[PDB]
Motif scaffolding. Sequence first.
Motif, PDB file in Angstrom:
ATOM      1  N   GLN A   1       0.820  -1.207   0.000  1.00  0.00           N
ATOM      2  CA  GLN A   1       0.000   0.000   0.000  1.00  0.00           C
ATOM      3  C   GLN A   1       0.857   1.261   0.000  1.00  0.00           C
ATOM      4  N   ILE A   2       1.957   1.270   0.747  1.00  0.00           N
ATOM      5  CA  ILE A   2       2.930   2.354   0.670  1.00  0.00           C
ATOM      6  C   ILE A   2       3.878   2.008  -0.474  1.00  0.00           C
TER       7      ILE A   2
ATOM      8  N   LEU B   1      -4.069   1.601   4.993  1.00  0.00           N
ATOM      9  CA  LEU B   1      -2.827   1.873   5.705  1.00  0.00           C
ATOM     10  C   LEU B   1      -2.088   3.086   5.165  1.00  0.00           C
TER      11      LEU B   1
ATOM     12  N   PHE C   1      -5.236  -4.397   4.374  1.00  0.00           N
ATOM     13  CA  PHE C   1      -3.789  -4.549   4.492  1.00  0.00           C
ATOM     14  C   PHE C   1      -3.081  -4.925   3.199  1.00  0.00           C
TER      15      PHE C   1
ATOM     16  N   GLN D   1      -0.486  -6.968  -4.654  1.00  0.00           N
ATOM     17  CA  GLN D   1      -0.151  -8.079  -3.781  1.00  0.00           C
ATOM     18  C   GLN D   1      -1.231  -9.143  -3.806  1.00  0.00           C
TER      19      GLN D   1
ATOM     20  N   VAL E   1      14.322   2.966   9.917  1.00  0.00           N
ATOM     21  CA  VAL E   1      13.001   3.464  10.285  1.00  0.00           C
ATOM     22  C   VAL E   1      11.886   2.455  10.024  1.00  0.00           C
ATOM     23  N   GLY E   2      12.131   1.426   9.216  1.00  0.00           N
ATOM     24  CA  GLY E   2      11.135   0.400   9.009  1.00  0.00           C
ATOM     25  C   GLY E   2      11.136  -0.654  10.099  1.00  0.00           C
ATOM     26  N   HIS E   3      10.062  -1.439  10.135  1.00  0.00           N
ATOM     27  CA  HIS E   3       9.903  -2.486  11.133  1.00  0.00           C
ATOM     28  C   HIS E   3       9.701  -3.875  10.547  1.00  0.00           C
ATOM     29  N   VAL E   4       9.728  -4.026   9.222  1.00  0.00           N
ATOM     30  CA  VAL E   4       9.678  -5.355   8.614  1.00  0.00           C
ATOM     31  C   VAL E   4      10.849  -6.197   9.102  1.00  0.00           C
TER      32      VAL E   4
ATOM     33  N   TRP F   1      10.535  -7.447  12.686  1.00  0.00           N
ATOM     34  CA  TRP F   1       9.768  -8.681  12.785  1.00  0.00           C
ATOM     35  C   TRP F   1      10.585  -9.882  12.336  1.00  0.00           C
ATOM     36  N   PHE F   2      11.412  -9.727  11.302  1.00  0.00           N
ATOM     37  CA  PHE F   2      12.278 -10.841  10.916  1.00  0.00           C
ATOM     38  C   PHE F   2      13.273 -11.194  12.022  1.00  0.00           C
TER      39      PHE F   2
ATOM     40  N   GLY G   1      11.376 -12.983  14.789  1.00  0.00           N
ATOM     41  CA  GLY G   1      11.016 -14.339  14.416  1.00  0.00           C
ATOM     42  C   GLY G   1      12.191 -15.296  14.448  1.00  0.00           C
TER      43      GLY G   1
ATOM     44  N   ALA H   1      13.084 -15.956  18.019  1.00  0.00           N
ATOM     45  CA  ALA H   1      12.111 -16.835  18.655  1.00  0.00           C
ATOM     46  C   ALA H   1      12.326 -18.283  18.247  1.00  0.00           C
ATOM     47  N   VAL H   2      12.590 -18.524  16.962  1.00  0.00           N
ATOM     48  CA  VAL H   2      12.866 -19.881  16.502  1.00  0.00           C
ATOM     49  C   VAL H   2      14.112 -20.436  17.183  1.00  0.00           C
TER      50      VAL H   2
ATOM     51  N   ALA I   1      13.352 -21.248  20.807  1.00  0.00           N
ATOM     52  CA  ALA I   1      12.514 -22.435  20.880  1.00  0.00           C
ATOM     53  C   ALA I   1      13.321 -23.703  20.644  1.00  0.00           C
ATOM     54  N   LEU I   2      14.239 -23.685  19.677  1.00  0.00           N
ATOM     55  CA  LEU I   2      15.058 -24.865  19.423  1.00  0.00           C
ATOM     56  C   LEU I   2      15.971 -25.171  20.602  1.00  0.00           C
TER      57      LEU I   2
HETATM   58  C1  LIG Z   1       4.295 -17.540   8.972  1.00  0.00           C
HETATM   59  C2  LIG Z   1       4.680 -18.134  10.323  1.00  0.00           C
HETATM   60  C3  LIG Z   1       4.145 -17.324  11.516  1.00  0.00           C
HETATM   61  C4  LIG Z   1       2.615 -17.398  11.714  1.00  0.00           C
HETATM   62  C5  LIG Z   1       1.772 -17.362  10.410  1.00  0.00           C
HETATM   63  C6  LIG Z   1       1.782 -16.003   9.669  1.00  0.00           C
HETATM   64  C7  LIG Z   1       2.559 -14.828  10.337  1.00  0.00           C
HETATM   65  C8  LIG Z   1       2.754 -13.564   9.450  1.00  0.00           C
HETATM   66  C9  LIG Z   1       1.679 -12.442   9.567  1.00  0.00           C
HETATM   67  C10 LIG Z   1       2.190 -11.010   9.261  1.00  0.00           C
HETATM   68  C11 LIG Z   1       1.162  -9.988   8.707  1.00  0.00           C
HETATM   69  C12 LIG Z   1       1.761  -8.675   8.154  1.00  0.00           C
HETATM   70  C13 LIG Z   1       0.807  -7.736   7.373  1.00  0.00           C
HETATM   71  C14 LIG Z   1       0.536  -8.170   5.905  1.00  0.00           C
HETATM   72  C15 LIG Z   1       0.330  -7.031   4.872  1.00  0.00           C
HETATM   73  C16 LIG Z   1       1.589  -6.361   4.329  1.00  0.00           C
HETATM   74  O1  LIG Z   1       2.142  -6.687   3.299  1.00  0.00           O
HETATM   75  O2  LIG Z   1       2.106  -5.325   5.077  1.00  0.00           O
HETATM   76  C17 LIG Z   1       1.272  -4.197   5.378  1.00  0.00           C
HETATM   77  C18 LIG Z   1       2.009  -2.821   5.201  1.00  0.00           C
HETATM   78  O3  LIG Z   1       3.158  -2.712   5.998  1.00  0.00           O
HETATM   79  C19 LIG Z   1       3.863  -1.486   6.035  1.00  0.00           C
HETATM   80  O4  LIG Z   1       3.100  -0.550   6.733  1.00  0.00           O
HETATM   81  C20 LIG Z   1       2.984  -0.472   8.141  1.00  0.00           C
HETATM   82  C21 LIG Z   1       1.631   0.214   8.494  1.00  0.00           C
HETATM   83  O5  LIG Z   1       0.608  -0.542   7.944  1.00  0.00           O
HETATM   84  C22 LIG Z   1       1.566   1.654   7.926  1.00  0.00           C
HETATM   85  O6  LIG Z   1       0.379   2.224   8.397  1.00  0.00           O
HETATM   86  C23 LIG Z   1       2.736   2.551   8.385  1.00  0.00           C
HETATM   87  O7  LIG Z   1       2.688   3.773   7.714  1.00  0.00           O
HETATM   88  C24 LIG Z   1       4.104   1.921   8.068  1.00  0.00           C
HETATM   89  O8  LIG Z   1       5.080   2.804   8.634  1.00  0.00           O
HETATM   90  C25 LIG Z   1       6.443   2.538   8.386  1.00  0.00           C
HETATM   91  O9  LIG Z   1       6.823   3.383   7.306  1.00  0.00           O
HETATM   92  C26 LIG Z   1       6.629   4.765   7.453  1.00  0.00           C
HETATM   93  C27 LIG Z   1       7.082   5.551   6.193  1.00  0.00           C
HETATM   94  O10 LIG Z   1       6.279   5.104   5.131  1.00  0.00           O
HETATM   95  C28 LIG Z   1       7.285   5.386   8.712  1.00  0.00           C
HETATM   96  O11 LIG Z   1       6.728   6.653   8.916  1.00  0.00           O
HETATM   97  C29 LIG Z   1       6.948   4.535   9.955  1.00  0.00           C
HETATM   98  O12 LIG Z   1       7.780   4.886  11.018  1.00  0.00           O
HETATM   99  C30 LIG Z   1       7.213   3.034   9.652  1.00  0.00           C
HETATM  100  O13 LIG Z   1       8.559   2.891   9.335  1.00  0.00           O
HETATM  101  C31 LIG Z   1       4.208   0.397   8.619  1.00  0.00           C
HETATM  102  O14 LIG Z   1       5.414  -0.100   8.211  1.00  0.00           O
HETATM  103  P1  LIG Z   1       6.592  -1.005   9.167  1.00  0.00           P
HETATM  104  O15 LIG Z   1       6.173  -0.898  10.595  1.00  0.00           O
HETATM  105  O16 LIG Z   1       7.886  -0.767   8.488  1.00  0.00           O
HETATM  106  O17 LIG Z   1       6.505  -2.759   9.024  1.00  0.00           O
HETATM  107  C32 LIG Z   1       5.547  -3.445   9.723  1.00  0.00           C
HETATM  108  C33 LIG Z   1       4.539  -4.167   8.754  1.00  0.00           C
HETATM  109  C34 LIG Z   1       5.330  -4.990   7.705  1.00  0.00           C
HETATM  110  O18 LIG Z   1       4.883  -6.285   7.380  1.00  0.00           O
HETATM  111  C35 LIG Z   1       5.290  -7.321   8.165  1.00  0.00           C
HETATM  112  O19 LIG Z   1       4.486  -7.896   8.872  1.00  0.00           O
HETATM  113  C36 LIG Z   1       6.761  -7.680   8.089  1.00  0.00           C
HETATM  114  C37 LIG Z   1       7.059  -9.137   7.722  1.00  0.00           C
HETATM  115  C38 LIG Z   1       7.305 -10.017   8.950  1.00  0.00           C
HETATM  116  C39 LIG Z   1       7.943 -11.379   8.647  1.00  0.00           C
HETATM  117  C40 LIG Z   1       8.026 -12.372   9.816  1.00  0.00           C
HETATM  118  C41 LIG Z   1       9.228 -13.336   9.767  1.00  0.00           C
HETATM  119  C42 LIG Z   1       9.075 -14.672  10.549  1.00  0.00           C
HETATM  120  C43 LIG Z   1      10.417 -15.252  11.055  1.00  0.00           C
HETATM  121  C44 LIG Z   1      10.922 -16.575  10.438  1.00  0.00           C
HETATM  122  C45 LIG Z   1       9.846 -17.656  10.382  1.00  0.00           C
HETATM  123  C46 LIG Z   1      12.200 -17.109  11.165  1.00  0.00           C
HETATM  124  C47 LIG Z   1      12.869 -18.384  10.600  1.00  0.00           C
HETATM  125  C48 LIG Z   1      12.136 -19.735  10.875  1.00  0.00           C
HETATM  126  C49 LIG Z   1      11.898 -20.615   9.616  1.00  0.00           C
HETATM  127  C50 LIG Z   1      11.790 -22.143   9.870  1.00  0.00           C
HETATM  128  C51 LIG Z   1      12.127 -22.583  11.315  1.00  0.00           C
HETATM  129  C52 LIG Z   1      12.297 -24.108  11.505  1.00  0.00           C
HETATM  130  C53 LIG Z   1      13.705 -24.561  11.891  1.00  0.00           C
HETATM  131  O20 LIG Z   1       3.594  -4.865   9.575  1.00  0.00           O
HETATM  132  C54 LIG Z   1       4.002  -5.753  10.532  1.00  0.00           C
HETATM  133  O21 LIG Z   1       5.191  -5.975  10.690  1.00  0.00           O
HETATM  134  C55 LIG Z   1       2.886  -6.418  11.351  1.00  0.00           C
HETATM  135  C56 LIG Z   1       3.227  -6.811  12.817  1.00  0.00           C
HETATM  136  C57 LIG Z   1       3.325  -8.346  13.096  1.00  0.00           C
HETATM  137  C58 LIG Z   1       4.231  -9.200  12.141  1.00  0.00           C
HETATM  138  C59 LIG Z   1       4.345 -10.707  12.522  1.00  0.00           C
HETATM  139  C60 LIG Z   1       5.589 -11.210  13.325  1.00  0.00           C
HETATM  140  C61 LIG Z   1       5.605 -12.711  13.776  1.00  0.00           C
HETATM  141  C62 LIG Z   1       6.943 -13.325  14.313  1.00  0.00           C
HETATM  142  C63 LIG Z   1       7.115 -13.340  15.872  1.00  0.00           C
HETATM  143  C64 LIG Z   1       7.115 -14.743  16.578  1.00  0.00           C
HETATM  144  C65 LIG Z   1       8.291 -15.718  16.217  1.00  0.00           C
HETATM  145  C66 LIG Z   1       7.903 -17.111  15.617  1.00  0.00           C
HETATM  146  C67 LIG Z   1       7.734 -18.265  16.649  1.00  0.00           C
HETATM  147  C68 LIG Z   1       8.852 -19.336  16.648  1.00  0.00           C
HETATM  148  C69 LIG Z   1       8.563 -20.562  17.524  1.00  0.00           C
HETATM  149  C70 LIG Z   1       4.189  -0.969   4.602  1.00  0.00           C
HETATM  150  O22 LIG Z   1       5.179  -1.825   4.117  1.00  0.00           O
HETATM  151  C71 LIG Z   1       2.972  -1.055   3.652  1.00  0.00           C
HETATM  152  O23 LIG Z   1       3.419  -0.881   2.343  1.00  0.00           O
HETATM  153  C72 LIG Z   1       2.337  -2.459   3.738  1.00  0.00           C
HETATM  154  O24 LIG Z   1       1.108  -2.385   3.068  1.00  0.00           O
END
Ligand SMILES: CCCCCCCCCCCCCCCC(=O)OC[C@H]1O[C@H](O[C@@H]2[C@H](O)[C@@H](O)[C@H](O)[C@@H](O[C@H]3O[C@H](CO)[C@@H](O)[C@H](O)[C@@H]3O)[C@@H]2OP(=O)(O)OC[C@@H](COC(=O)CCCCCCCC[C@H](C)CCCCCCCC)OC(=O)CCCCCCCCCCCCCCC)[C@@H](O)[C@@H](O)[C@@H]1O
Lengths: 149, 223, 139, 152, 299, 56, 115, 73
Positions: A5-6, E298, G15, G20, H41-44, H47-48, H51, H54-55, H58-59
């Motif tokens: 979206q951004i 968003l 979202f 996407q 400044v981003g938070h993607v 979260w990585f 995650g 956390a993995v 957990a292991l």
């Molecule tokens: C899969 C397995 C797990 C369970 C199943 C599924 C889980 C995944 C679910 C995640 C859902 C995410 C949302 C999906 C949609 C999407 O697409 O996104 C939305 C939007 O987002 C951003 O906008 C934010 C706002 O919406 C806007 O309002 C705002 O303006 C904008 O502001 C930034 O920008 C501005 C300038 O523009 C600056 O002014 C401002 O300061 C700021 O910087 C924002 O952005 P920002 O905060 O940067 O990022 C954050 C976004 C970005 O997406 C994301 O989730 C990031 C991707 C996360 C990836 C997770 C990785 C997982 C780890 C691995 C599995 C590890 C390895 C293990 C493998 C195997 C292991 C076996 C051995 O949301 C999030 O993180 C959501 C929070 C939660 C995420 C989930 C975390 C779970 C892990 C924790 C637990 C551990 C696991 C347990 C182990 C036992 C911009 O991008 C936008 O375009 C975009 O549109």
Amino acid sequence: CSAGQISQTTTQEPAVNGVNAQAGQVSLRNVHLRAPQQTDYVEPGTTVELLFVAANDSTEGSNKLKSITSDVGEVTLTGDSTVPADGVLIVGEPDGQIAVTAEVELTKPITNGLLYDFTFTFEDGETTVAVPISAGEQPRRPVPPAGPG
Amino acid sequence: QSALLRTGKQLFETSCVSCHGANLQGVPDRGPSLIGTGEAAVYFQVSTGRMPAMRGEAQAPSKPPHFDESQIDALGAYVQANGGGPTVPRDDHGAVAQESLIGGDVARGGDLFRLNCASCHNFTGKGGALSSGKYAPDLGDANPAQIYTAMLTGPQNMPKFSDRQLTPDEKRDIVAYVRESAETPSYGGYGLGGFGPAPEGMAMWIIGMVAAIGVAMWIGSRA
Amino acid sequence: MHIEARLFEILTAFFALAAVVYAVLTAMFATGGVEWAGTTALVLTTGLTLITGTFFRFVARRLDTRPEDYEDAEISDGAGELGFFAPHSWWPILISLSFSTAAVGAALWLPWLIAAGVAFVITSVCGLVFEYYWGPEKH
Amino acid sequence: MRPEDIDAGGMETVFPWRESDGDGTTVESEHKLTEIAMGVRNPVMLIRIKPADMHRVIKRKGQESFNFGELFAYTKVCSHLGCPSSLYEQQTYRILCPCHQSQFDALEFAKPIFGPAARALAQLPITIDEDGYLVANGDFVEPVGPAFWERK
Amino acid sequence: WSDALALGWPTGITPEAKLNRELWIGSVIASFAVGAIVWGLIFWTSAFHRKKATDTELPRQFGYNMPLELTLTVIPFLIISVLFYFTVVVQERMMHKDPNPEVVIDVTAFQWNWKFGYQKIAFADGSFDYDGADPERKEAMTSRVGPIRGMTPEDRTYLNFDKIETLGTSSEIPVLVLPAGKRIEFVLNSADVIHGFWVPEFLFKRDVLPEPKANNSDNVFQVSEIQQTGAFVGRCTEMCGTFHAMMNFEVRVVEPNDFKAYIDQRNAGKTNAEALAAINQPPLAITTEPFESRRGELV
Amino acid sequence: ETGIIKRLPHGAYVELHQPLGPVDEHGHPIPLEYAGAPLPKRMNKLGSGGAPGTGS
Amino acid sequence: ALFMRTELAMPGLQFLSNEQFNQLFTMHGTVMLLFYATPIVFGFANLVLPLQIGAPDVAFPRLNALSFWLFLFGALIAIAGFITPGGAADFGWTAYSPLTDAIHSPGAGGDLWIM
Amino acid sequence: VDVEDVPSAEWGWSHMPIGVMHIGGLLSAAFLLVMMRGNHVGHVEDWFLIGFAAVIVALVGRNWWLRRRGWIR
Ligand SMILES: CCCCCCCCCCCCCCCC(=O)OC[C@H]1O[C@H](O[C@@H]2[C@H](O)[C@@H](O)[C@H](O)[C@@H](O[C@H]3O[C@H](CO)[C@@H](O)[C@H](O)[C@@H]3O)[C@@H]2OP(=O)(O)OC[C@@H](COC(=O)CCCCCCCC[C@H](C)CCCCCCCC)OC(=O)CCCCCCCCCCCCCCC)[C@@H](O)[C@@H](O)[C@@H]1O
Ligand SMILES: CCCCCCCCCCCCCCCC(=O)OC[C@H]1O[C@H](O[C@@H]2[C@H](O)[C@@H](O)[C@H](O)[C@@H](O[C@H]3O[C@H](CO)[C@@H](O)[C@H](O)[C@@H]3O)[C@@H]2OP(=O)(O)OC[C@@H](COC(=O)CCCCCCCC[C@H](C)CCCCCCCC)OC(=O)CCCCCCCCCCCCCCC)[C@@H](O)[C@@H](O)[C@@H]1O
Ligand SMILES: CC(C)=CCC/C(C)=C/CC/C(C)=C/CC/C(C)=C/CC/C(C)=C\CC/C(C)=C/CC/C(C)=C/CC/C(C)=C/CC/C(C)=C/CC1=C(C)C(=O)c2ccccc2C1=O
Ligand SMILES: CCCCCCCCCCCCCCCC(=O)O[C@H](COC(=O)CCCCCCC[C@@H](C)CCCCCCCCC)COP(=O)(O)O[C@H]1[C@H](O)[C@H](O)[C@@H](O)[C@@H](O)[C@@H]1O
Ligand code: HEC
Ligand code: HEC
Ligand SMILES: CCCCCCCCCCCCC
Ligand code: FES
Ligand SMILES: [Ca+2]
Ligand SMILES: [Cu+2]
Ligand SMILES: [Cu+2]
């Protein structure tokens, strides 16, 4: 992750010197001053030109431009300042344009680089813009040859 | 020409309005205003195929053009009539200038390119990465007019270079350097892409070292 | 192995009829005449089953009944060596990594990566084809 | 250089020049200009902000008047390790250093937002003289270039 | 009830749509009957042939019932032959084209909006004739050796241009205005990729192609009449890129005299919205509204 | 493992093995001790393929 | 599919963007059809078919291993479109022309999908 | 290690203490968490980092628990 979206492309602004402005239901595009300069200022008493394009967001009715004021001087509007149903109103003939005009009689000096406030008043909408000066397609002015030092 | 203006509007209406608006004012969060961008911007954006854009991401790519030369002229004339702006240089016959844009001083062009251009496009216009999904592209396919108008209009995140910041003769020197550094052969063998240490180190490991180890295996024994 | 040939011959009969019917029915009262893509595909599907069925039919009339073709064969009829079946190999994964290198090269249009991938493919396929034929090292 | 020589969205490299440095025809002028070109803390990026983006500019304390309207001047020397940090993205307003990928926010006083850089790029105060030529309005208010034990 | 059995199909607003809906309802009833039989057979054996506590021997080991096998290939063949017959009848009626339509509309799809042109009007009672073709602009597209039969791929000559045109905008839904009770002909062309012309109340859609003639597509279809006035949504039904979900249109069906008044207004230089206000219609689309151009919540 | 599969009269499938040392009266090899040195794993690397035939 | 379904629960884009979402149905269909169902056919065949005919092995054991590794690495090549800035293929699993041409789908995601 | 677990256990270094790997995992997770401190400044990426940390935790925790309970040695 760049296609969410951004998005970086979609919020990009035009790469022009003029300014955009929202006057209620009117879009003011490419607003700029034409004012050829010679020294650090363009002095009061000079007549400079204010150019823009007004676009009617609405497509049902018509609109008209009144009362452009500024604290750099007085603005005279010449021509039919009405903007049509879903059309444009070109005010002034910009640099590369091969008759509504806005003439600014200056009361305080202006200089290229700074921004100047202008208030546009339509019969529905009225806003202030902070307009720049744009040398358009004019060539670079000669610089006196420096000596040996 | 009124025919050229109506053809440009007619082409614009079923290709560009969804993102730029019926009055060229822009559609918010979809595409910018085109007022004052000029014929030169249209020429660069449409002749390199970047326009019409297909989606929003980090950077809109170049791709095959959707319009031919006369349609590009028509679209540029239509955009020029709404706000003016810079135009594409022409030759005597009114064609878009290509050969007359090649400047005569390629050493000055190289110095200017290294000051102004190589930071984003690399020593010899091979491209370079930008911040987050963006990139300055390889310059080897642009024709002289495309290089000239790219400097003139400042596309996407490329800085805008006005005719006062870089005069037309400076721009022609730059296009001469860009074109000649694209057409010059390598002197010391295959050019390996022109990026230097990274492909050279790849060539050592995958060609030189593989050969040396294979020869060692042939001469030596196992176990 | 007469049933094996019969299966492909039956498929061939159906495919040939479908190809002829489709070409004739699209040539007549179908816009543009013969639909060339579907007609070509049906004709060469017929050719595919024809090649395999003709090969099986020629093989069947050579060799007399195998124990798997015999309705009351005994398990002990099949005693003896079957053939060579490779016990292990890491060359298949190398071949697939090489082909994937060339594919990524073609996707991103990197001619040097395509060249490297093709060279990798040739080396990996040589490694597979020679694996059970390299003699001892010589000194 | 004159302020109208740069369009909005443009960026130019500027150098500190004095009338007494000359045009480089004499030998002494040529040596002076060589010293200008080779000075490692000399090059400056002059950017012109789009007027529609001036409401997004955040000023640094002590530097609120360092810009001449919509013209800003930062050191072209990267504060991380001294490379010319000169990849200027006009739409994102991001200054990218090619060496180790530091990114500086031109709208927020060239503050680092990515990479190994921890410090902002120094801002040059600029103005114009009576002829309308861009001149420096004083010195940098902090040391320019890579940091060292003795700094700040 | 015919609505429950139609399963969400609109009632329809043309005779062809009504015939298609009848075919739909009959076919749904046939399929529900077959499904009830087969599901009941499944539920019966699952309910009454479960292993009891007092059976020690295995059940009778039958595996072949030849007359039943033959009888269960004939019946489905009969049902599909009946369905094929009625299918052919209805598709012949729906694809039928009369040599004298009373309104001929040019439909131009592009990424990602619609343009509707009025090519020709010939009312059956002689009360309205209008010739809207603009061949002085189709020739302006000629692009010319050429890669395809002497032409570059930018030729665009296959597209149609008319004097009265309603152009869709990201801020204005295009409203196509049609007379009720009249034979309407739609000629479909795409400017770039494949779109889809679906008015659900027509109970019918067709794909909108670039260069349909070179692709052997029949890009022309008619409705014999539209049987009621009103407003009806239309949607794009072929995946066409980013804004495939956001290029809808509307069909406004008015009485013939009002259609004549609307066309006179458009010929007098009025836009679509003001010409609709001139015949006492809502100026904008009322089944659908434009999508916000912000990319989401968003932003 | 030689890669040669054999069907026994009762229907068992066995792979033929080439012992690297002495065998039993049953015919299974006596297990050998690892000596820090590589072990052959292809019968062709033990000479089973022979040689083509002398000539150009 | 869970992402798509969550976005479709309410009107408006909560979202996801259009782009996407289009990538999501394209790659959901691609992964479910060609990376799950089609190779799991040969997974089941490898599990039991030699047993069902009373064989010790398949005809070509190394070709069998190669088929598995080609499945795995081809699927990884197609899915890796998601790590590019533009993203994965967004023209549907059916990939209709001319939507798939270089003019209308310029990204690297589509080419990675193809190869 | 026993030779049933590592056949060439008497030919080379075959055992790494489990505490080294448990502590190294915990410290690697903590290092992933400390890179949330930065100029970005981003938070993607935050979260990585969360995650992956956390993995890893957990292991490590699963391994430690299963060794304590005797299910793995
Ligand atoms: C899969 C397995 C797990 C369970 C199943 C599924 C889980 C995944 C679910 C995640 C859902 C995410 C949302 C999906 C949609 C999407 O697409 O996104 C939305 C939007 O987002 C951003 O906008 C934010 C706002 O919406 C806007 O309002 C705002 O303006 C904008 O502001 C930034 O920008 C501005 C300038 O523009 C600056 O002014 C401002 O300061 C700021 O910087 C924002 O952005 P920002 O905060 O940067 O990022 C954050 C976004 C970005 O997406 C994301 O989730 C990031 C991707 C996360 C990836 C997770 C990785 C997982 C780890 C691995 C599995 C590890 C390895 C293990 C493998 C195997 C292991 C076996 C051995 O949301 C999030 O993180 C959501 C929070 C939660 C995420 C989930 C975390 C779970 C892990 C924790 C637990 C551990 C696991 C347990 C182990 C036992 C911009 O991008 C936008 O375009 C975009 O549109
Ligand atoms: C012990 C032995 C050691 C010695 C080894 C020697 C081998 C090298 C060859 C010897 C040299 C010849 C003698 C004199 C040199 C010469 O006469 O040279 C001509 C010119 O040549 C290049 O001009 C291309 C065009 O001719 C120009 O028209 C064009 O302008 C130019 O364009 C560049 O410049 C533009 C600016 O204008 C930019 O716009 C543009 O983008 C680009 O940059 C071109 O260059 P470029 O595309 O670089 O190369 C493309 C090459 C093609 O690739 C190459 O062969 C490079 C190969 C070496 C690279 C090795 C990389 C290894 C990678 C790793 C393994 C990675 C993988 C590992 C990880 C896997 C992961 C899995 C887990 O062309 C082709 O033949 C394509 C068709 C087929 C290629 C095959 C040729 C030979 C090998 C084939 C292999 C077998 C099968 C066939 C393959 C298809 C440029 O150099 C020019 O300066 C130069 O002038
Ligand atoms: C720290 C860091 C840089 C992180 C980024 C790492 C990263 C994500 C890299 C991968 C980039 C890719 C390949 C992008 C597309 C997505 C994708 C297909 C990913 C992999 C998917 C996957 C795992 C499944 C498929 C199977 C598989 C393992 C695929 C093969 C992948 C291959 C072979 C790709 C190459 C990987 C790679 C990064 C290689 C670098 C090569 C280098 C350094 C060469 C330098 C070089 C260059 C760049 C030239 O321009 C050049 C020009 C002329 C001659 C020579 C050269 C030359 O050698
Ligand atoms: C050498 C390999 C080493 C492997 C080690 C394992 C470690 C894996 C860690 C995973 C990486 C996660 C960190 C990414 C955190 C981060 O910062 O990146 C994000 C971008 O997310 C992504 O794509 C996620 C990508 C993750 C890919 C998975 C990694 C595995 C790869 C390496 C496989 C390679 C296999 C090997 C190949 C050859 C050898 C064979 C093995 C956003 O940045 P940006 O780009 O600014 O996006 C802006 C918007 O936000 C904003 O709205 C707006 O839209 C714009 O501003 C936009 O630009
Ligand atoms: C939406 C998908 C678009 C379509 C369809 C077209 N354009 Fe576009 N354009 C779009 C964006 C988001 C941008 C800004 C960033 C970029 O990629 O450059 C643009 C840019 C232009 C420009 C440059 C403007 C400048 O500031 O000088 C021009 C001249 C332009 N677009 C023209 C244009 C034409 C003629 C189109 C029809 C063929 C067209 N665009 C389609 C978004 C979209
Ligand atoms: C980084 C900030 C750049 C600087 C400095 C220069 N260029 Fe650039 N350029 C850059 C980008 C990101 C792009 C792509 C923009 C697009 O809208 O897609 C470009 C583009 C060009 C082109 C067009 C290339 C084509 O695809 O053929 C040319 C010819 C070009 N740039 C040349 C050029 C010159 C001569 C420069 C010095 C004045 C220069 N660029 C500076 C990024 C950047
Ligand atoms: C508004 C009335 C809705 C009626 C729905 C009909 C039910 C359909 C049956 C479902 C199929 C069962 C397998
Ligand atoms: S020198 Fe600028 S990031 Fe290192
Ligand atoms: Ca939603
Ligand atoms: Cu569509
Ligand atoms: Cu669509």
